[PDB]
Design an enzyme around this catalytic site. Structure first.
Site, PDB file in Angstrom:
ATOM      1  N   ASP A  57      -3.135   1.179  -0.375  1.00  0.00           N
ATOM      2  CA  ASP A  57      -4.412   1.148   0.330  1.00  0.00           C
ATOM      3  C   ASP A  57      -4.772   2.623   0.639  1.00  0.00           C
ATOM      4  O   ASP A  57      -3.878   3.464   0.689  1.00  0.00           O
ATOM      5  CB  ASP A  57      -4.325   0.303   1.631  1.00  0.00           C
ATOM      6  CG  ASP A  57      -5.549   0.571   2.470  1.00  0.00           C
ATOM      7  OD1 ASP A  57      -6.666   0.194   2.146  1.00  0.00           O
ATOM      8  OD2 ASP A  57      -5.314   1.396   3.457  1.00  0.00           O
ATOM      9  N   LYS A  70       3.348  14.773  -2.558  1.00  0.00           N
ATOM     10  CA  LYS A  70       2.331  15.224  -3.501  1.00  0.00           C
ATOM     11  C   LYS A  70       1.998  14.197  -4.591  1.00  0.00           C
ATOM     12  O   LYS A  70       1.774  14.586  -5.741  1.00  0.00           O
ATOM     13  N   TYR A  89     -15.001  -0.542  -1.864  1.00  0.00           N
ATOM     14  CA  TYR A  89     -15.253  -1.790  -1.097  1.00  0.00           C
ATOM     15  C   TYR A  89     -15.838  -1.431   0.275  1.00  0.00           C
ATOM     16  O   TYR A  89     -15.984  -0.251   0.613  1.00  0.00           O
ATOM     17  CB  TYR A  89     -13.988  -2.671  -0.994  1.00  0.00           C
ATOM     18  CG  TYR A  89     -12.742  -2.025  -0.362  1.00  0.00           C
ATOM     19  CD1 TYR A  89     -11.885  -1.241  -1.143  1.00  0.00           C
ATOM     20  CD2 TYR A  89     -12.442  -2.240   0.993  1.00  0.00           C
ATOM     21  CE1 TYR A  89     -10.727  -0.689  -0.578  1.00  0.00           C
ATOM     22  CE2 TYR A  89     -11.282  -1.691   1.556  1.00  0.00           C
ATOM     23  CZ  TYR A  89     -10.421  -0.919   0.769  1.00  0.00           C
ATOM     24  OH  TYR A  89      -9.286  -0.396   1.305  1.00  0.00           O
ATOM     25  N   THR A 114      -5.938  -5.260   9.952  1.00  0.00           N
ATOM     26  CA  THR A 114      -5.125  -5.489   8.732  1.00  0.00           C
ATOM     27  C   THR A 114      -3.743  -4.848   8.905  1.00  0.00           C
ATOM     28  O   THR A 114      -2.701  -5.410   8.537  1.00  0.00           O
ATOM     29  CB  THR A 114      -5.785  -5.008   7.421  1.00  0.00           C
ATOM     30  OG1 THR A 114      -5.867  -3.609   7.500  1.00  0.00           O
ATOM     31  CG2 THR A 114      -7.179  -5.601   7.246  1.00  0.00           C
ATOM     32  N   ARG A 118      -4.115   1.731   7.912  1.00  0.00           N
ATOM     33  CA  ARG A 118      -4.800   1.194   6.726  1.00  0.00           C
ATOM     34  C   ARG A 118      -6.260   1.572   6.866  1.00  0.00           C
ATOM     35  O   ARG A 118      -6.676   1.861   7.973  1.00  0.00           O
ATOM     36  CB  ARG A 118      -4.547  -0.300   6.621  1.00  0.00           C
ATOM     37  CG  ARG A 118      -3.178  -0.579   6.001  1.00  0.00           C
ATOM     38  CD  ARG A 118      -2.929  -2.050   5.708  1.00  0.00           C
ATOM     39  NE  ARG A 118      -3.951  -2.651   4.846  1.00  0.00           N
ATOM     40  CZ  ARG A 118      -3.751  -3.761   4.131  1.00  0.00           C
ATOM     41  NH1 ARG A 118      -2.567  -4.389   4.157  1.00  0.00           N
ATOM     42  NH2 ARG A 118      -4.685  -4.328   3.360  1.00  0.00           N
ATOM     43  N   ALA A 120      -9.647  -0.087   6.084  1.00  0.00           N
ATOM     44  CA  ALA A 120     -10.523  -1.046   6.668  1.00  0.00           C
ATOM     45  C   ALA A 120     -10.064  -1.541   8.066  1.00  0.00           C
ATOM     46  O   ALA A 120     -10.909  -1.699   8.931  1.00  0.00           O
ATOM     47  CB  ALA A 120     -10.783  -2.221   5.708  1.00  0.00           C
ATOM     48  N   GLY A 121      -8.750  -1.762   8.261  1.00  0.00           N
ATOM     49  CA  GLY A 121      -8.107  -2.284   9.491  1.00  0.00           C
ATOM     50  C   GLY A 121      -7.760  -1.281  10.584  1.00  0.00           C
ATOM     51  O   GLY A 121      -7.533  -1.648  11.729  1.00  0.00           O
ATOM     52  N   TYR A 189      -5.633  -8.172   5.201  1.00  0.00           N
ATOM     53  CA  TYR A 189      -6.960  -8.691   5.284  1.00  0.00           C
ATOM     54  C   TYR A 189      -7.092 -10.149   5.648  1.00  0.00           C
ATOM     55  O   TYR A 189      -7.932 -10.532   6.464  1.00  0.00           O
ATOM     56  CB  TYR A 189      -7.679  -8.526   3.970  1.00  0.00           C
ATOM     57  CG  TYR A 189      -7.815  -7.124   3.439  1.00  0.00           C
ATOM     58  CD1 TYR A 189      -8.782  -6.257   3.927  1.00  0.00           C
ATOM     59  CD2 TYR A 189      -7.029  -6.684   2.371  1.00  0.00           C
ATOM     60  CE1 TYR A 189      -8.962  -4.997   3.371  1.00  0.00           C
ATOM     61  CE2 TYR A 189      -7.170  -5.418   1.813  1.00  0.00           C
ATOM     62  CZ  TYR A 189      -8.143  -4.570   2.319  1.00  0.00           C
ATOM     63  OH  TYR A 189      -8.261  -3.313   1.787  1.00  0.00           O
ATOM     64  N   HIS A 250      -8.152   0.617  -3.597  1.00  0.00           N
ATOM     65  CA  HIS A 250      -6.709   0.808  -3.567  1.00  0.00           C
ATOM     66  C   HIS A 250      -6.347   1.357  -4.923  1.00  0.00           C
ATOM     67  O   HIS A 250      -6.917   0.961  -5.944  1.00  0.00           O
ATOM     68  CB  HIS A 250      -6.010  -0.539  -3.379  1.00  0.00           C
ATOM     69  CG  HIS A 250      -6.227  -1.157  -2.004  1.00  0.00           C
ATOM     70  ND1 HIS A 250      -5.516  -2.276  -1.594  1.00  0.00           N
ATOM     71  CD2 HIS A 250      -7.051  -0.826  -0.974  1.00  0.00           C
ATOM     72  CE1 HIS A 250      -5.897  -2.576  -0.368  1.00  0.00           C
ATOM     73  NE2 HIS A 250      -6.810  -1.720   0.020  1.00  0.00           N
ATOM     74  N   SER A 256       2.824  13.792  -9.161  1.00  0.00           N
ATOM     75  CA  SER A 256       1.864  14.764  -9.586  1.00  0.00           C
ATOM     76  C   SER A 256       2.528  15.591 -10.748  1.00  0.00           C
ATOM     77  O   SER A 256       1.851  16.051 -11.675  1.00  0.00           O
ATOM     78  CB  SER A 256       1.368  15.635  -8.439  1.00  0.00           C
ATOM     79  OG  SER A 256      -0.052  15.781  -8.551  1.00  0.00           O
TER      80      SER A 256
HETATM   81 FE   LIG Z   1      -7.729  -1.479   1.947  1.00  0.00          FE
END
Ligand SMILES: [Fe+3]
EC number: 3.4.21.-
Length: 324
Positions: A57, A70, A89, A114, A118, A120-121, A189, A250, A256
């Protein structure tokens, strides 16, 4: 060789084995499985070579892109429809229809997140609410400020020890209460949304599609609504007009230096053609057994999008904006 996949749980490991076994039966690019317990253990594993890839996420793509790891996003998941596909999103605030409180009148309310750190949460709602948290910066942890703002919350991952209020609405059993895993029913979610539906909280901080995914009947979904940033409430289908932020999807992260960006890309590219959406009756790359959700990749994802080279977590993430 093999791209070693990182699972953060047994069911995720279980699905990884099935994935490996189906890539074989189909004579495709090989995949192998490492079992870890969290996004961090996987982030280290990869860093230190016991694995090559893990889907994360945005708040974790953030943490991985830092030293000593990294890590770098390699493929983004794709949402939406094949018809209208997207690699971003919407972070929304879902509530019960009937209430009258707005985004700006949430003090003392109960919240469902969530999970800790994270997008959104946590990261999005908490940056948004910040002007109302009265938070006396470092050294004072944000969680301390948050715990005094909402009365009780469910923040999978919070330190029940120093912030019991944040784990208060959580539904897990025993030591699992407030776990950042699916052993905690209000995790992620779907769980953050269940916390709202069960009436444990007043607001759930999730993404746009969860209500549509968790509720097939249009009637039920009319019982819900969203808190907009202009301090209004809008119906659920209006996320485009009412959201706290627009966020990059996500993404699969890799090293790297000697990350195997190319092997990872071909494996994803073929798994998607073979076991992607509606492709095989035998194995679904985007599909979880009943009881589980978003095992390895998001359940509603339709595919992957390759991220152009040398593009760091920084620029990946810089794509997003807080409701303007
Ligand atoms: Fe997410």
């Amino acid at each position: 060789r093999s791209v070693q996949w990182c699972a953060v749980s047994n069911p995720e490991a279980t699905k990884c084995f099935q994935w490996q076994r189906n890539m074989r039966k189909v004579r495709g690019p090989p995949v192998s499985c490492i079992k870890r317990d969290s996004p961090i253990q996987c982030i280290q594993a990869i860093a230190e070579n016991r694995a090559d890839a893990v889907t994360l996420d945005g708040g974790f793509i953030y943490e991985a892109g830092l030293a000593p790891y990294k890590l770098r996003p390699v493929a983004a998941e794709v949402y939406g429809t094949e018809r209208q596909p997207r690699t971003h999103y919407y972070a929304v605030a879902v509530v019960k229809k009937g209430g009258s409180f707005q985004l700006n009148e949430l003090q003392g309310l109960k919240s469902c997140h969530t999970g800790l750190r994270r997008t959104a949460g946590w990261n999005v709602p908490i940056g948004t609410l910040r002007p109302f948290l009265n938070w006396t910066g470092p050294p004072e942890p944000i969680e301390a400020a948050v715990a005094r703002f909402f009365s009780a919350s469910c923040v999978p991952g919070a330190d029940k020890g120093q912030f019991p209020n944040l784990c208060r609405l959580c539904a897990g059993t025993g030591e699992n209460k407030c776990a950042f895993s699916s052993q905690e029913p209000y995790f992620s979610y779907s769980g953050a949304f269940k916390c709202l539906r069960d009436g444990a909280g007043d607001v759930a901080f999730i993404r746009e599609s969860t209500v549509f995914e968790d509720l097939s009947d249009e009637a039920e979904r009319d019982e819900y609504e969203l808190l907009c940033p202009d301090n209004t409430r809008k119906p659920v289908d209006k996320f485009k007009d009412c959201h706290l932020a627009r966020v990059p999807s996500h993404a699969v992260v890799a090293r790297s230096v000697n990350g195997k960006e190319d092997a990872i890309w071909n494996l994803l590219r073929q798994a998607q053609e073979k076991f992607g959406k509606d492709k095989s009756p035998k194995f679904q790359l985007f599909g979880s057994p009943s009881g589980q959700k978003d095992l390895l990749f998001k359940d509603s994802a339709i595919g992957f999008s390759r991220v152009p080279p040398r593009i760091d977590s920084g620029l990946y993430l810089g794509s997003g904006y807080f409701t303007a």
